[PDB]
Amino acid sequence: QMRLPSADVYRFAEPDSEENIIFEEGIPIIKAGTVIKLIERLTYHMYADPNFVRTFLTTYRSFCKPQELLSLIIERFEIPEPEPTEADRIAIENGDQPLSAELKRFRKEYIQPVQLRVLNVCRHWVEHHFYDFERDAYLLQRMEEFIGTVRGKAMKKWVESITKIIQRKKIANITFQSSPPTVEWHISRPGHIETFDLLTLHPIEIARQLTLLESDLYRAVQPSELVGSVWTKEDKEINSPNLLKMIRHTTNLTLWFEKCIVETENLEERVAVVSRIIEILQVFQELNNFNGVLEVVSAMNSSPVYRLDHTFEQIPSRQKKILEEAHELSEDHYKKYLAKLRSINPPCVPFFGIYLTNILKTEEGNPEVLKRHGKELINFSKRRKVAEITGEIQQYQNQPYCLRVESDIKRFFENLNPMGNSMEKEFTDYLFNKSLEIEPRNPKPLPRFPKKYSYPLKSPGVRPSNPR
Amino acid sequence: GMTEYKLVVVGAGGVGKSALTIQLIQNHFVDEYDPTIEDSYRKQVVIDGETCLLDILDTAGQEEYSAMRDQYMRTGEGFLCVFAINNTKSFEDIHQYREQIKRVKDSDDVPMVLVGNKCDLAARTVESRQAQDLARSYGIPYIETSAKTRQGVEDAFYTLVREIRQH
Amino acid sequence: MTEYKLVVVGAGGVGKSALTIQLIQNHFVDEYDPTIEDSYRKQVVIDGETCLLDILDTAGQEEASAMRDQYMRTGEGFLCVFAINNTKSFEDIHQYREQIKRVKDSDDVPMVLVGNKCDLAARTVESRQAQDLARSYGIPYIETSAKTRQGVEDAFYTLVREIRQH
Ligand SMILES: Nc1nc2c(ncn2[C@@H]2O[C@H](COP(=O)(O)OP(=O)(O)NP(=O)(O)O)[C@@H](O)[C@H]2O)c(=O)[nH]1
Numbered sequence A: 001q002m003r004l005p006s007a008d009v010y011r012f013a014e015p016d017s018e019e020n021i022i023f024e025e026g027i028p029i030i031k032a033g034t035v036i037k038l039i040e041r042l043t044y045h046m047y048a049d050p051n052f053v054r055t056f057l058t059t060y061r062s063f064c065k066p067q068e069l070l071s072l073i074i075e076r077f078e079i080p081e082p083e084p085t086e087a088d089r090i091a092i093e094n095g096d097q098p099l100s101a102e103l104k105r106f107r108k109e110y111i112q113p114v115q116l117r118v119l120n121v122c123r124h125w126v127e128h129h130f131y132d133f134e135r136d137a138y139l140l141q142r143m144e145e146f147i148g149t150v151r152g153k154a155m156k157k158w159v160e161s162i163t164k165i166i167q168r169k170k171i172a173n174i175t176f177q178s179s180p181p182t183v184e185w186h187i188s189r190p191g192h193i194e195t196f197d198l199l200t201l202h203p204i205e206i207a208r209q210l211t212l213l214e215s216d217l218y219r220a221v222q223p224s225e226l227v228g229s230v231w232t233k234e235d236k237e238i239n240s241p242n243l244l245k246m247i248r249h250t251t252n253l254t255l256w257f258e259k260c261i262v263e264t265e266n267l268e269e270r271v272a273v274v275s276r277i278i279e280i281l282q283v284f285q286e287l288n289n290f291n292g293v294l295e296v297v298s299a300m301n302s303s304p305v306y307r308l309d310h311t312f313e314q315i316p317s318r319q320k321k322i323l324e325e326a327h328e329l330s331e332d333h334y335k336k337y338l339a340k341l342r343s344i345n346p347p348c349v350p351f352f353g354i355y356l357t358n359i360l361k362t363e364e365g366n367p368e369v370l371k372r373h374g375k376e377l378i379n380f381s382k383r384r385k386v387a388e389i390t391g392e393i394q395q396y397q398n399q400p401y402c403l404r405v406e407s408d409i410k411r412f413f414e415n416l417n418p419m420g421n422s423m424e425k426e427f428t429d430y431l432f433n434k435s436l437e438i439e440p441r442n443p444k445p446l447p448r449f450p451k452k453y454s455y456p457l458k459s460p461g462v463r464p465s466n467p468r
Numbered sequence B: 001g002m003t004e005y006k007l008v009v010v011g012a013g014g015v016g017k018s019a020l021t022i023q024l025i026q027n028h029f030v031d032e033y034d035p036t037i038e039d040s041y042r043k044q045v046v047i048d049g050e051t052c053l054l055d056i057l058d059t060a061g062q063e064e065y066s067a068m069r070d071q072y073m074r075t076g077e078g079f080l081c082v083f084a085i086n087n088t089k090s091f092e093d094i095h096q097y098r099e100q101i102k103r104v105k106d107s108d109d110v111p112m113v114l115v116g117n118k119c120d121l122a123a124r125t126v127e128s129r130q131a132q133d134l135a136r137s138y139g140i141p142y143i144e145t146s147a148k149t150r151q152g153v154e155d156a157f158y159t160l161v162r163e164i165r166q167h
Numbered sequence C: 001m002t003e004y005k006l007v008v009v010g011a012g013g014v015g016k017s018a019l020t021i022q023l024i025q026n027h028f029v030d031e032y033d034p035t036i037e038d039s040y041r042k043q044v045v046i047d048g049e050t051c052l053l054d055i056l057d058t059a060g061q062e063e064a065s066a067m068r069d070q071y072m073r074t075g076e077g078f079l080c081v082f083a084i085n086n087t088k089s090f091e092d093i094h095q096y097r098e099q100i101k102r103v104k105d106s107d108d109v110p111m112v113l114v115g116n117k118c119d120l121a122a123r124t125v126e127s128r129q130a131q132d133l134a135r136s137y138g139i140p141y142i143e144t145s146a147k148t149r150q151g152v153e154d155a156f157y158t159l160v161r162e163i164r165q166h
């Protein structure tokens, strides 16, 4: 086994012990450790662990500042070479070239792997966690300086590469190649944005364009918006703007559905509205847009809508079944949803809410440190659990939908604003009062209301068409 | 077999709400939690001699999904309305949560408890007298809990189960 | 869902990373940024069964040649990639095949031979030559383009099938 530098000149050569590292019960899994040990294992000479690199880079800010991390990995990089051995000494004393076997082995099996793995940490840091550098320009200067002054031809290719990657990142296309289906139109025709509405757009195309929108919003959320539970804290608008944009879209669409329903006072017309929404739900299911599915289900379980007995009575049985199956996804703490998400063929749009709750509870329910033998060790298993969740999120963010954007329909749903200028409670009370108006509580008699739509209510259905 | 109670935790985000259920379902003999596993929100308990099963829904972290609140609340037969004693706004939110629960359950008499949660050492801003008066005005119990020591946690959940049983 | 550990190996610049990113993101990487070691995951339904693919994207640069044992031990299946416009990369294939066999101490390791960059006209390795090699290994040969997506799914999912039947 290779001898190491003295732990006095090189801190990362301390022997493992339960005072500085604890392993979980073919590479070891770390339960806890000092920062020094975490970084040693992050850049271990015996093996790579690219998943450890992602986990560490995603979660380290809870136990180490970015500036300090950079200092520590630079320290890790600077490994002292051993002195010539007795055999080397003898060779030199006789004017011969030493074999330097121990030196050569140490270079090949310790220094070069550790240094490359340090560079791999830098590369991942810059490529996938560049926000540290966006938020701290001096940090970036330090990284550029470190990388730009690494000498030696063994590291040269990656040094030159990482230098270019950083420069690209500072100033910062899909193949399918099967074509997306034809955009479908109903009563509203292309370019006639003024007529766009729930019943006038094609229900297929409503579901497609909302899915593209919701997929884009889902794909835009970075782990930086999630770690430390920052979307729940006072600075959430600063730290989690993409997550909040995504959630506010979902909320707005649910409210829009409720509004469309209760502002349609005529029972027959309202039935057509609900049927159309369940058809959109069906296309959401076909597209694996689970955010969309729950958007609809949440609307149907809302107080204003849920109580509409007369409307429910007239929904066709086959649509009741569709709505019921969608609802059952959320039953028993999303048991069937979780199973379904793990079984489908992506692309999909997950429901983000479950991830948020699991990240928050993991963070609040586990200690930052473990106390062992008088020492405080970083509880890394807690961080690994968080990174498992962010990792799953990222896995579903890779696959793009093969659907064509319709710019006007996209804009229509981007600009949807059912609450108008009203505050939430005001709007919420309004919807419930509308509900009470259109279907009064027993024993008040059911009134009649005039029709509001001048166009046909008959749905074109949700099976796609294909002319030549 | 044994009765199962569907309990729902509601209240403002960002102020330690989740500690209540975590501390219950945990064991406070090991500081540990995996919310990912089923039985992280199910717990068999004995209350006044009668064994029952508690199913707790705590959607902490999903507060911004405000249009899902009805759907989540609809699933429950008893409610813990949680505020943080160092956050007056969360206390002022309680009224609307109670109104929303009443509407969703279509009843003026829904089993619920008011819970004042102490989530850190920041200064208290809601005095217990204020919270007691509010709870009395609603005709419901008030329990204060610590997010750190597990104090009051069993009392909060058991009291709610008693409200359900005596409904 | 079963989890599968795939490893992509071969000489520097043959398009290992481009192939992997095309599979994962449907995107073609034009830049040549030499890999040290990257990891990707992909949930995908193959032959009607949902799979979780763990894909290890490895270093082809010779300066990293001393660091291969560690990932070869963990991999269940290997994509052995050369570029059809680079004869040396084809000659490098046999070295990877032999090391993998060595490390895993087996003559029966799931593998697929991949001839990448098949979008380019200036071919220097003939299909027949590569096919002969694959037959000698007892494995399939698939020509691919990370640029056009030609054969990319076929290469990775064929490897999954080999692991599945192993
Ligand atoms: N025309 C064409 N170019 C390709 C193809 N695949 C990769 N390339 C190009 O070839 C270069 C090398 O690609 P890369 O994926 O980085 O190769 P690699 O095998 O991962 N290299 P390394 O071993 O150093 O990590 C890039 O410029 C890339 O755009 C392909 O199928 N067709």
Ligand SMILES: Cc1cc2nc(N3CCNCC3)n(Cc3ccc(F)c(Cl)c3)c2cc1C
Residues within 6 Å of the ligand: A274, A297, A300, A301, A305, A306, A307, A308, A309, A311, A312, A313, A315, A320, A323, A324, A325, A327, A328
């Ligand atoms: C799975 C599921 C079952 C539902 N059963 C009903 N009700 C039936 C009669 N009594 C009132 C409630 N609602 C509320 C409702 C209201 C007006 C509708 F058109 C429809 Cl379609 C539904 C349900 C919502 C869902 C998600």
Ligand SMILES: [Mg+2]
Residues within 6 Å of the ligand: C016, C017, C018, C033, C034, C035, C057, C058, C059, C060
């Ligand atoms: Mg590469």
